[PDB]
Structure 1
Amino acid sequence: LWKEMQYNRDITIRFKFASSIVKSGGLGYKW
């Protein structure tokens, strides 16, 4: 059969974003 076991945990999600910066041709005035 099956047993129920509990897990309450105090978590700290530490995350962040990343950025994709792709620039267009020319002299660099356009992204």
Structure 2
Amino acid sequence: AQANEDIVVSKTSLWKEMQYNRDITIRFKFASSIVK
């Protein structure tokens, strides 16, 4: 297994099911609205 695998759980001619497992670094921020 891996921290960033790309597994296949089903596949057809035009479509497939991809199981993505990934580690992420979510960097978010706040926005303040000021009305005076």
Q: Identify unmatched segments of 5+ residues in structure 1.
A: 24-31
* Residue correspondences, number: 21
TM-score (norm 1): 0.52
Task: Using CA pairs under 8 Å that are at least 6 residues apart, name the structure with larger relative contact order, 1 or 2.
Answer: 2
Larger radius of gyration: 1
Q: Percent identical across equivalent pairs?
A: 95
TM-score (norm 2): 0.47
* Runs of 4+ off more than 4 Å: none
Q: Would you tell me which structure has more strand in proportion to its own residues? A: 2
